[PDB]
Amino acid sequence: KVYGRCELAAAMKRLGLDNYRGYSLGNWVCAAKFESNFNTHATNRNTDGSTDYGILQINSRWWCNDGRTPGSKNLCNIPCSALLSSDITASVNCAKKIASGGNGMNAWVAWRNRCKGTDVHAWIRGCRL
Incomplete structure (x- = not known):
């Protein structure tokens, strides 16, 4: 889904x-852009074997179960494929869980690098919010 x-x-x-954890919407939107160019079905494989899923490119070594990661866990208690859909609630509910852990939205290297310290409103400017 585009x-x-x-x-x-x-x-x-x-x-x-x-304001989920005190983060304005533009923060989310921007992070989705630079992480997966708004494609709810992007997947970037990684070195240690882990694969990043969906809108907000959520990783399989700790957040999901794809059953292909010769490593560890599933803190979000959801199968990766759930994140690859047009309905981004699975990714957005899991996302809430990542942002609850200290770093907040620092986990999204793409957010951090191109969105912490930007005019985030910039991304919601024009909408029917």
Whole structure:
């Protein structure tokens, strides 16, 4: 799914991902952009064998179970494929769980590198929020 800026933003809004842990929506939208160019079905494989899933490219070594990762866990208690869908609630509910752990949204290297310290409103400017 190729979500629009305002489409995706509207979704992320109703799923209460605004000020979630005191982070404005544009933070989420931007992170989705630079992490998976809004493609709810992107997957980037990694060195240790781990694979990143969905909208907010959530990794299999600790957040999901794909049953292919010769390593560790599943803190989000959800099978990876659940994250690869047009309905980003699985990814957005799991996301809430990652952001609850100290680093907050620092986990999203792409957020951090291109969105911590930017005009985030910039991404929700124009929408029917």
